[PDB]
Amino acid sequence: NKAWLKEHNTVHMMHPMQDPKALHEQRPLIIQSGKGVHITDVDGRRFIDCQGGLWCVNAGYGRREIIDAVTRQMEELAYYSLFPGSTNAPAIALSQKLTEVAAEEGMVKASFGLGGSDAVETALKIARQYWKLEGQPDKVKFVSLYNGYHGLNFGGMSACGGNAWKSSYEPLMPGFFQVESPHLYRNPFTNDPEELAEICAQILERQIEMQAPGTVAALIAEPIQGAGGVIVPPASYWPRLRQICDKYDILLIADEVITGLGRSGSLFGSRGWGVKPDIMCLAKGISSGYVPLSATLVNSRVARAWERDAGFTSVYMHGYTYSGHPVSCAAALAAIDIVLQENLAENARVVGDYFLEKLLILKDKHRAIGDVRGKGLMLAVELVKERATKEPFGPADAYPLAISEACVNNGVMIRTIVNKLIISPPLTFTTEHVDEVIEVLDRAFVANPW
Amino acid sequence: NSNNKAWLKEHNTVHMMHPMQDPKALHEQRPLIIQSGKGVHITDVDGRRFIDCQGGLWCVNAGYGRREIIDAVTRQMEELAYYSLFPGSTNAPAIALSQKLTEVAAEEGMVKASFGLGGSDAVETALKIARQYWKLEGQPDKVKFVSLYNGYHGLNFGGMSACGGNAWKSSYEPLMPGFFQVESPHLYRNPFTNDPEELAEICAQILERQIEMQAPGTVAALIAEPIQGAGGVIVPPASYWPRLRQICDKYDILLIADEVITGLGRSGSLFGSRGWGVKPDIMCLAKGISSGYVPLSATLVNSRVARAWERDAGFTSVYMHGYTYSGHPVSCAAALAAIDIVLQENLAENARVVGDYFLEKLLILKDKHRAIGDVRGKGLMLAVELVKERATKEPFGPADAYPLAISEACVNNGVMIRTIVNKLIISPPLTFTTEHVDEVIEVLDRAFVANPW
Amino acid sequence: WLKEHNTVHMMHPMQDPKALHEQRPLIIQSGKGVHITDVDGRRFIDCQGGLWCVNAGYGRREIIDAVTRQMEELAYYSLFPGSTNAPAIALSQKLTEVAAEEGMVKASFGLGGSDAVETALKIARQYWKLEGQPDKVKFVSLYNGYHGLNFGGMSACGGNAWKSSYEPLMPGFFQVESPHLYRNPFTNDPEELAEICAQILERQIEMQAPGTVAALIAEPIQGAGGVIVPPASYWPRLRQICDKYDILLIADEVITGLGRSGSLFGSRGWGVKPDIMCLAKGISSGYVPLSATLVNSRVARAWERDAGFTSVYMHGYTYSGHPVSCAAALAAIDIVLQENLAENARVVGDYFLEKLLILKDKHRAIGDVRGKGLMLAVELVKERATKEPFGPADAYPLAISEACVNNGVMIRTIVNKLIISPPLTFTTEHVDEVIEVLDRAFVANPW
Amino acid sequence: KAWLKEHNTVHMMHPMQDPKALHEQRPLIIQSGKGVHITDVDGRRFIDCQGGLWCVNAGYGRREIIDAVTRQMEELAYYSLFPGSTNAPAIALSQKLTEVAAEEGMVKASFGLGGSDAVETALKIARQYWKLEGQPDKVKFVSLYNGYHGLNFGGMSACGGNAWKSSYEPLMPGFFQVESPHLYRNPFTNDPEELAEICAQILERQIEMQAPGTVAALIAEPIQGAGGVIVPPASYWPRLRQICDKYDILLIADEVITGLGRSGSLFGSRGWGVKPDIMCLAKGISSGYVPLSATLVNSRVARAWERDAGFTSVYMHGYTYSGHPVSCAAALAAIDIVLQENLAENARVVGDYFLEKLLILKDKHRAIGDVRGKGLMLAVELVKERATKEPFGPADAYPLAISEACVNNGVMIRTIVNKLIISPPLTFTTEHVDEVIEVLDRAFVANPW
Ligand SMILES: *Cc1c(COP(=O)(O)O)cnc(C)c1O
């Protein structure tokens, strides 16, 4: 019951991303239930969930379609592997559905996992094996971007573009390099986004040339950087990435764990930039968070390498016990059907557009707002101590937490990443939900002048 | 489409990268599409029924069709499908499961749980915890990991780097620096001795000497399975793990017990390490922790480890690890129900007893059939190792036909047993009975009779 | 047994063995002043200065006699536990004297630039372990940097030519944009280029987390990278950055050390005091192999900590402090100081660069001319508007080089760049001779 | 002379030492050498059992080498082997080395300046070789416990003792060290033939575990020097050659000490009847008169570069002073001395005599746990108790007491922890042996244990 849960909250847990010392006195809310876009804690406090779980409950809470798919599959066959000798029906169905839905990008095969970190890990392993199959085993290095976030296994962590995720676990993998990215609001080059895109592309090219292209396997990048603070690159940037990868003969890995299946207002973030990656990483929203599932998709160029007469090198020696878990796959199938039938990519585009417009008005109103960024239903409000210098609030400062808490205490679940308020609701959000959130945020800023 | 047999058959493997396999092989040799499971049996799309000696993949420990787990899952999914343990929030099944796991592993001294989704995550988490632990304790040079020949620790770059068989490693090199593997006490294939106690002591001394060579001040942890699973069901001598604990105490490195297979009963004790009377510093759990019904893993730590975060160490004491689906309320609901099943039906004891019986019956098979070079087991993990000649122990290769013939003769007579190279692997649900044992042994015997060597 | 065995039993440095079957190198037999003579009596002005190293010229009785006298007295004894030797002690004091402006108080000896760099890298790592920050293990360096050939130095190089055949190299070595005005994607303003490259360096350090970074290593003027002189503001910014992020500044002075760039040290030429300095090549005028890695008081004092085994310096080669090498270096350093060759390099190099700019005006193939003191390069391009370089396979640069060699001037190429690094005793008359021959080479090979 | 004493250690980073120790315990300033004797600045004369540092193999004051050096420096002090040029002493020395190492199949030399350079060169050569042969995954190096392979990052990563490694971590990925057949200290057996076979099988299984397709080479010393003069069983190195052949990895012989005679054969590998793929030489190659190293390769390795492989066939290695004409002139004179005076045979005979005398000493004094030697490479290992083989630690006084008694009675012998190391010039005589043995005997008598 409630008292037991409150007593035991955090005591036997290593909570992600937190210092356990802070949790002795500052206990997290015990979220008890969800319906639609709202969540309710054990004490009955109700919120609009602007976190959307954690960028993943894209279809909303309480979807009977997914619950029923999960129950029926688990009643019939709770588990069987895709390891030598067997497969299962939901995994087959989901594999075909994914090659269908990502046909535009040229995806022809799926490798399943359980979350975004393993989707990324799978992608990195695939790239290395691909080049060994292609008779270029020196191609082993990975390039990624400043502010990129690619998950927490040693591979993805080595590919991350912020040291916060890396420093305590060093030394990380050799051969991982990060380069300047087109973050307009904080860059040393220019206030022109097209010039910024081009200078960042050329920096990337010159680092690749420095490494020797014959030693580089792939570039990995998010179409829109999520955990790095919702950084939307200039539209010319990703086409340049595709050109650079073609030029130096390295793979383009699109980390679509957040942008996959609609959030940024296109069915894929790459598609939103009109770019076809070689490899795509999907997780989070692909199952609406109801059951863990990830998928790494590859194109024919990549897949055909395993059709070489290469002996043991053509054995795909990867894949997790729960790869293709039939309950995961059932959930993912129902969620993708919802995404398509209700055109949540378009709803994200429109409601996200409206949301972004209202935030821009809010920015003019409240001096602590240094920057507002968004595409579809991924948005961030960046708070600064001084607009002229763009000096950020530190993790230690109180103001971001004050704004967050004023929202939370008035029924709007918005949390921070350092100095940035992050907005990533379910893709079923309405303009009315937007107006509610904007009203509460406005009141929060009014009550906390800067 | 998930109910359309001819569709399933025509799209089987076409759009998928199957684990551990050459896609060239799958155009003509199509895997069985398993459609349903009940108890210890599974049924394919064509209605063929099998005793599932794979136990899914060492993980359906409670059996198929368990209403307890199904209902727990449904009810939790109706209430709250998901919410994170990230700054600001938690959920009730995650709190409950964290407390349950520390209770069940009280004997080993486990006080905190870090959740993930599968064994590879559990291992990666253990490795990250060890490195951060030693930075917290003011010894940041302690970064190296030692593991064992034939060890399997999953497939992310960390775990893969810790594996003791190159099959999982070579296509993805170069792997992580600072991972070293040493001689392990594999009685059937070792260059030292036919005496198991002498083998344990020599392997212990070899380990010590490699640690000393690395300099202990650069080594963070030893990782090892209480009984090696994918390496081919290799049961160490009883003295080995107590020596491992002693070696770790002597050199001041952490002992990580990879219990992804042995955790929660399969080897005939609730934990493999407990089976050896050893308390690890960190325990990796997955697979059977949820009976395979929903992906879940847990990495447990003792007080010694957890308290390193209880210091003013600035940003070094922020645990910057944890997966989006860490603590998934549905996964945790499933794991709570499976653990209640394991405890209430004493599946650790059933694994112990029925496994002892299974191993005895396997020795009869070894007596009759020349190709069986070795039979191994503890609790309900067993292997039958096939060799071309017993005097030399020359193994069948992955390319050879005999192991596969024995397997197919079983599958075609209602017994799902597959191979890892030259070894037939047996890891059924822990609810297996002695009568199930005899059914499988009769089928296996007939397979060997039909395939003389 | 010389022309018949030339290259036959040899793995020649920096070369494709396929090329050596087709055309064999000149067997150089003798040297005098700034001239060299081959086995057939062909005489050349040596614009290579051996290999950036015969800084005092050939045939210096001062150095030859120092060497003979020492080898007659004591050919060798080590600096290992229990022993030392006199020339090593003397050279130690001389180096701390000469580099007093930079704050250098200790030297670790070696045999060449690669070991000097390896020594600096090991010192930096051990320093941070002594200072209680063992996570500080990564190294940052510059595009076009050249830091020798052992695995550390090779890892630190900023050109892939030295790297790709030996991969995978050391983890934790990162290279960043450097201010090469002639070829950069940012600006043609050198002050703006210096500042943008400094900010790029800062942001890469921050990306790595400064607590994982040990040191920056850089050449005051980049040599093998093609004689790239940075803007004057750049190195003060490097010192500022290293102070801000608490990483060591390693100055690779293997070429610029002891006068070639027109200051006794390149870092001095920029008014910057490094934490660690690498010296080789010209330190002994190439007469006997010798290198020295110097450290300041900040670095040295870390070993005075009660740190147990961490404070044992487990580095140093058999021939560290070789008495003959040290005697040769003492004589060469005396010559550098006695004849003020740093000032001569400054003045005659200024003159050389002026003459080269006139040549640039005259001949379309010269895209850029660069120099500081007596390190100069003429960079040849297929079209100046695009700066398209000649490739290693192209004939024109080798044609110019061969016309010089066939007219008594030893100038070789680094790809599309003619490199000039003569002895520091070079005169304006030597300059005019070389310039006339170069001019006729261009006239005879019109572009 | 007074200035030498005042500035001793003051401006210097002394190898292998804590600088705090050097403020008060100053090293002896060695001033001159003749024959096998050295003299310090105070006129104290010593028999140099260090042979400089395993390197003054022809003795001190050799007119042949001094004159070769002087005349060469008089003619041409330096010119490079870099694109466009070469020099005569370099050509001559390459041919001489290919002739002297003909038995081993050595056909090409890449020159350097010291043993660390020779090892680094071997490692780079191996990696580039396998890339040329179309197997670029072959990058890992296996070496032996107690192996010493110099101090650059590659060689340091290959070392088999952590003392050289821990202060500079993290070292290179892909370097692995295995059990070696050190009879005196091993967990397996007191039978050397059995020890050789078990260590060979441990090496095989580690290679197999790594996957042979990822391993470039094994590097090992025919007799381990800095690790404490560890002589392997005679069967071991033939097994090493068999293993390298079986798994298709290169065998690198680190002959920096054993090269050119010290162990009683012209090469240690020859002493074991084994032909390596790559050989590392330094130290004695020039009798220590001028810094020089050479890395030799056989036809198997060399032919890889004769391929149309584009840039991969460019040897982008070689130091400024590779093939330094003065160094090469010195080495040619030193090799001439080694051959004409058959110093390999003298090392064999006088070393066997030396080892016999040391065994008598072991019978005499309980502090001696073990005596080891081949040719003029010998060690006396001191232990606090023979039954347990408990060593003296670096902190203990007894080994230093024995060493100081020898030094104070005219015999220059130093320690590596608990081991007295003996490596005199290869011109050592039986008379010299008896001189040293008398002094050592009295040192032990004066310091009973
Ligand atoms: C002494 C030694 C080295 C070190 O060589 P340096 O000349 O000191 O660089 C390397 N390898 C072996 C086998 C040695 O004996």
Author numbering:
A (entry chain B): 10 to 459
B (entry chain A): 7 to 459
C (entry chain C): 13 to 459
D (entry chain D): 11 to 459
Provide passages from the article that reported this PDB entry:
One of the most important groups among PLP-dependent enzymes are transaminases (TAs). These enzymes catalyze the transfer of an amino group from an amino donor to an amino acceptor. In short, the reaction starts with a holo-enzyme complex where PLP is initially bound to the enzyme through an imine bond with the ε-NH2 of the catalytic lysine (internal aldimine). In the present study, we intend to better understand the molecular interactions that govern PLP binding in three industrially relevant ωTAs, namely from Halomonas elongata (HeTA), Chromobacterium violaceum (CvTA) and Pseudomonas fluorescens (PfTA).
In order to compare the three enzymes at the molecular level we crystallized PfTA in the presence of the cofactor, PLP. Data from crystals grown in a condition with PEG6000 as the precipitant diffracted to 2.2 Å resolution and the structure was solved by molecular replacement. The crystal structure showed a tetrameric arrangement of PfTA with the cofactor positioned at the interface of two subunits and PLP linked to K293. V129 is well-defined and in proximity to D264, which is within hydrogen bonding distance to H159 and the pyridinium nitrogen. The X-ray structure of PfTA herein solved, shows that the 4 PLP binding sites are near to the oligomerization interface, which may link the stability of the PLP-enzyme complex to the quaternary structure. A similar structural rearrangement has been observed for the TA from Vibrio fluvialis and from Pseudomonas sp. Interestingly, in PfTA, an additional Trp residue (W174) seems to further stabilize the Y159 of the PLP-ring motif into establishing π-π stacking interactions with the cofactor pyridine ring. In this case, the binding loop is also constrained by the interaction with another subunit of the tetrameric structure. Both factors (the quaternary structure that provides a more rigid environment typical of tetrameric TAs, and the presence of the non-conserved tryptophan in close vicinity to the tyrosine) might contribute into explaining the high PLP binding affinity. In both cases, the corresponding Val residues (V129 in PfTA and V119 in PsTA) are part of an alpha helix located near to the oligomerization interface; between two monomers and near to the dimer-dimer interaction. Therefore, the replacement of that Val by an Asn may disrupt some crucial hydrophobic interactions required for the assembly of the quaternary structure needed for the enzyme stability, but also for the enzyme activity under PLP saturation conditions.
